[PDB]
Scaffold this active site. Sequence first.
Site, mmCIF file in Angstrom:
data_model
loop_
_atom_site.group_PDB
_atom_site.id
_atom_site.type_symbol
_atom_site.label_atom_id
_atom_site.label_comp_id
_atom_site.label_asym_id
_atom_site.label_seq_id
_atom_site.Cartn_x
_atom_site.Cartn_y
_atom_site.Cartn_z
ATOM 1 N N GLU A 158 15.568 42.453 4.910
ATOM 2 C CA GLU A 158 14.623 41.497 4.260
ATOM 3 C C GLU A 158 13.505 41.742 4.190
ATOM 4 O OE1 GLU A 158 16.491 38.637 1.741
ATOM 5 O OE2 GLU A 158 18.535 39.727 1.416
ATOM 6 N N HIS A 207 15.395 37.814 -1.175
ATOM 7 C CA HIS A 207 14.336 39.130 -1.344
ATOM 8 C C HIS A 207 14.207 40.036 -2.608
ATOM 9 C CE1 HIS A 207 13.587 36.370 2.042
ATOM 10 N NE2 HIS A 207 12.528 36.933 2.062
ATOM 11 N N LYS A 245 16.367 29.942 -2.375
ATOM 12 C CA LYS A 245 14.338 30.522 -2.360
ATOM 13 C C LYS A 245 14.890 32.201 -2.325
ATOM 14 C CE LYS A 245 10.994 31.831 1.019
ATOM 15 N NZ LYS A 245 10.364 32.023 2.450
HETATM 16 C C1 LIG Z 1 9.306 32.622 3.271
HETATM 17 C C2 LIG Z 1 8.965 33.804 2.628
HETATM 18 O O1 LIG Z 1 6.988 33.478 1.640
HETATM 19 C C3 LIG Z 1 6.678 34.908 1.220
HETATM 20 C C4 LIG Z 1 4.862 34.843 1.768
HETATM 21 O O2 LIG Z 1 4.636 35.944 0.939
HETATM 22 O O3 LIG Z 1 5.005 33.727 1.392
HETATM 23 C C5 LIG Z 1 7.208 36.271 1.475
HETATM 24 C C6 LIG Z 1 8.829 36.109 2.233
HETATM 25 O O4 LIG Z 1 9.571 37.505 1.717
HETATM 26 C C7 LIG Z 1 9.272 34.952 2.717
HETATM 27 O O5 LIG Z 1 10.467 34.904 2.847
#
Ligand SMILES: *Cc1oc(C(=O)O)cc(=O)c1O
Lengths: 254, 252
Positions: free
Chosen positions: B87, B144, B171
């Site tokens: 990820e 992701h 998330k």
């Molecule tokens: C928390 C988080 O933020 C970003 C970002 O581009 O700010 C990407 C990401 O993969 C992630 O887990």
Amino acid sequence: MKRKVQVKNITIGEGRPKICVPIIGKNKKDIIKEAKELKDACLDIIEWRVDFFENVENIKEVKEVLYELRSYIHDIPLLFTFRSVVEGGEKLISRDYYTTLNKEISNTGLVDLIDVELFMGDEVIDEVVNFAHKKEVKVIISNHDFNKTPKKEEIVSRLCRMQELGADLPKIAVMPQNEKDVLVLLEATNEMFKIYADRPIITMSMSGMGVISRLCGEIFGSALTFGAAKSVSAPGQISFKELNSVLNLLHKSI
Amino acid sequence: MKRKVQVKNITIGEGRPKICVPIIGKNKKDIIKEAKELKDACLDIIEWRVDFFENVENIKEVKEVLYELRSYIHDIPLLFTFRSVVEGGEKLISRDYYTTLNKEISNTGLVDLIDVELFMGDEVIDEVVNFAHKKEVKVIISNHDFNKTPKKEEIVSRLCRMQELGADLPKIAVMPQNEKDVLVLLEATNEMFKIYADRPIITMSMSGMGVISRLCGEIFGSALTFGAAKAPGQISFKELNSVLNLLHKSIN
Ligand SMILES: *Cc1oc(C(=O)O)cc(=O)c1O
Ligand SMILES: *Cc1oc(C(=O)O)cc(=O)c1O
């Protein structure tokens, strides 16, 4: 490809969206006072919302203000807009006077663009657009819906009609009833930008919920965004200084 | 009425989205230097991307950084994240160690949140979530997609699965292939927010094209937004904060 729209030394349709700020003064003194607050700020275009001007029905007094205004803003592009009551305006006037006002003002050579409403009909639009073009004035053909966001295909159909009518810059402003409606406006904007448009377009989703539509023109396709002169919201408005900052931040992100 | 997530004095899910900034230092001195730039700055939460830490496989050195870091940011919520290689992370480690790391760090009482990946599987997730909750640590369950933006319904399905697995904060971060993909991410966010969510969620569309998704969370439903400390597709956190307040005031 697409045509760019040049007004004074500003190229609409290229790079970062251009910021337009309206002057809404009720009298000559207030209009000039507003103009002096905008003459040296980072903005691209000034719009005179002449429907707020108390003596708008007297062409001579309208011209007098225009002369003075022109002298203070120098070479900043000036958009002349009489917004009718049916589309949010302040003053009832006749159809004949609407046509005469726009033609006479286009004839002065003092305005760079004029905003004409789609809803006035083909007869009025044909007359005002053809005359504006004869005088090298650019034309925004606009449409507003203060109660709903028409479907994507409806928005695209209106913007296409504006192109067919000779608008240099089709403009549509709609009211979201929900968050998804804001996204529809943005979806319609990009579909038009990518598939149907052969010139720059202007779109917005009004109210607090629709503010993203004022910020993301570079990505989705709106060529011009409107900021408020003062630093107080309606709400659903963004002061032009803060709008400039956000646009620069998004331009540099990519 | 919907649950908020309280971390120290920050209420996630109320008002404007909260700003989180990562520390990506490769060693202790660099991590501390970064923390010192963020400690009195206009942000809400600090994220330690521990996968960048060269000595990450030594739990004692990870703890040492944490104790030192806490002398600088005693009252700022701290999110602890080991982002795995699949990820976008920097360092390969075993599944057992990924679990051990998150448990022993949660047990220190020095992190306010941890981030664990949905695709690590329910066995790993159930163990880490259960243990984190016993220590009052909040859990972000993340996912992701760096290649594309899944369909609206698949984005919603994943956010729902995260809730089912006990995430305090689901998330998702996805990659747009076109402008419409950015709108898909925003549409999924608000659909989840209004219809299926019983807790705050975090969403974003990556790259320069998706930057708008980091700014409009109050309207569409993302409760946390990530800024950069110092890259196309990233926004310095300093600017991010003025924008969020600007947008918070423009609401009807
Ligand atoms: C928390 C988080 O933020 C970003 C970002 O581009 O700010 C990407 C990401 O993969 C992630 O887990
Ligand atoms: C040009 C234009 O802008 C707005 C705005 O709110 O900025 C509204 C509107 O009706 C219009 O015609």
